[PDB]
Design an enzyme around this catalytic site. Sequence first.
Site, PDB file in Angstrom:
ATOM      1  N   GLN A  19       0.802  -1.216   0.000  1.00 29.82           N
ATOM      2  CA  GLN A  19       0.000   0.000   0.000  1.00 29.82           C
ATOM      3  C   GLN A  19       0.832   1.262   0.000  1.00 29.82           C
ATOM      4  OE1 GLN A  19      -2.011  -1.035   3.820  1.00 29.82           O
ATOM      5  NE2 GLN A  19      -1.644   1.093   4.366  1.00 29.82           N
ATOM      6  N   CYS A  25      -5.490   0.398   3.408  1.00 30.27           N
ATOM      7  CA  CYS A  25      -5.619  -0.954   3.891  1.00 30.27           C
ATOM      8  C   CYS A  25      -7.047  -1.483   3.741  1.00 30.27           C
ATOM      9  CB  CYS A  25      -5.208  -1.000   5.359  1.00 30.27           C
ATOM     10  SG  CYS A  25      -6.081   0.198   6.399  1.00 30.27           S
ATOM     11  N   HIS A 164      -6.519  -0.855  11.440  1.00 27.86           N
ATOM     12  CA  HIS A 164      -5.918  -1.338  10.214  1.00 27.86           C
ATOM     13  C   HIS A 164      -6.741  -2.469   9.626  1.00 27.86           C
ATOM     14  CE1 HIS A 164      -2.700  -2.144   7.503  1.00 27.86           C
ATOM     15  NE2 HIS A 164      -2.376  -3.300   8.044  1.00 27.86           N
ATOM     16  N   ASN A 184      -1.699  -9.112   5.098  1.00 29.41           N
ATOM     17  CA  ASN A 184      -1.543  -7.697   5.253  1.00 29.41           C
ATOM     18  C   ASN A 184      -1.264  -7.117   3.876  1.00 29.41           C
ATOM     19  OD1 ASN A 184      -1.232  -5.202   6.550  1.00 29.41           O
ATOM     20  ND2 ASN A 184       0.729  -5.726   7.494  1.00 29.41           N
TER      21      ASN A 184
HETATM   22  O1  LIG Z   1      -4.210   1.584   5.853  1.00 27.99           O
HETATM   23  C1  LIG Z   1      -4.951   1.328   6.784  1.00 27.99           C
HETATM   24  C2  LIG Z   1      -5.156   2.580   7.604  1.00 27.99           C
HETATM   25  O2  LIG Z   1      -6.542   2.775   7.820  1.00 27.99           O
HETATM   26  C3  LIG Z   1      -7.095   3.919   8.363  1.00 27.99           C
HETATM   27  C4  LIG Z   1      -6.526   5.167   8.147  1.00 27.99           C
HETATM   28  C5  LIG Z   1      -7.127   6.286   8.697  1.00 27.99           C
HETATM   29  C6  LIG Z   1      -8.286   6.171   9.452  1.00 27.99           C
HETATM   30  C7  LIG Z   1      -8.865   4.924   9.655  1.00 27.99           C
HETATM   31  C8  LIG Z   1      -8.265   3.799   9.095  1.00 27.99           C
HETATM   32  C9  LIG Z   1      -8.810   2.429   9.313  1.00 27.99           C
HETATM   33  C10 LIG Z   1      -9.067   1.986  10.608  1.00 27.99           C
HETATM   34  C11 LIG Z   1      -9.546   0.692  10.834  1.00 27.99           C
HETATM   35  C12 LIG Z   1      -9.763  -0.153   9.761  1.00 27.99           C
HETATM   36  F1  LIG Z   1     -10.228  -1.415   9.959  1.00 27.99           F
HETATM   37  C13 LIG Z   1      -9.515   0.303   8.482  1.00 27.99           C
HETATM   38  F2  LIG Z   1      -9.733  -0.555   7.488  1.00 27.99           F
HETATM   39  C14 LIG Z   1      -9.026   1.587   8.251  1.00 27.99           C
HETATM   40  F3  LIG Z   1      -8.753   2.100   7.022  1.00 27.99           F
END
Ligand SMILES: OCCOc1ccccc1-c1ccc(F)c(F)c1F
Length: 217
Positions: A19, A25, A164, A184
């Site tokens: 990514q 994600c 994430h 991941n």
């Molecule tokens: O690259 C992943 C980062 O993700 C972020 C970034 C900014 C605010 C929230 C989140 C986020 C939190 C929880 C989750 F399960 C997610 F899938 C998700 F995207």
Amino acid sequence: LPDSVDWREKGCVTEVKYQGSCGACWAFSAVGALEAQLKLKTGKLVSLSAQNLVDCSTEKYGNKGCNGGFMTTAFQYIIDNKGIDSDASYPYKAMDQKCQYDSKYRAATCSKYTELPYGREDVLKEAVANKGPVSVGVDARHPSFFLYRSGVYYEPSCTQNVNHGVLVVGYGDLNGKEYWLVKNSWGHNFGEEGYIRMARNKGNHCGIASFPSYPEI
Ligand SMILES: OCCOc1ccccc1-c1ccc(F)c(F)c1F
């Protein structure tokens, strides 16, 4: 249910993606889940466009592209949109771009998605065994996460506050430790060729079973 599952063995998991410096994600998690269903339905394993979600499943879906989003609302976009493009056709740039969806490059559809009950690792096990890979959030904030190399990840400081999006592609037991097999999206340098085994049946460790969902074609 089977004692262990690995959807990689069934050819239902695409290559690990990277990514970069884009918080996409959620988009990788979502496409991963749908890729498995597409293989189950059509017999073809095809990487789907995370970029299509980043660029197109935006404010209407509560998503913020490289600044985060939801797997479930990504699924709803795919439903609403009547498709998602292949990764090859709509490649990943690790940046927010204008929506460039085109149905001529459609590689999958979604008809519905299902959210599993909060924190129920038994229900998650059933879905992974019987339905396919499941999109989940995990608490990946802790320094130990980034440094994981092998074994089964257990971090006493982990919480159920997830940050994430990742993909559960299996489960099992390694040397007496039950685990979830997690794909991941930090490239194959991360963990075990891009995967992490995370503690299973240890109190919803790292929130892995907090917010699981899977799509269907
Ligand atoms: O690259 C992943 C980062 O993700 C972020 C970034 C900014 C605010 C929230 C989140 C986020 C939190 C929880 C989750 F399960 C997610 F899938 C998700 F995207």
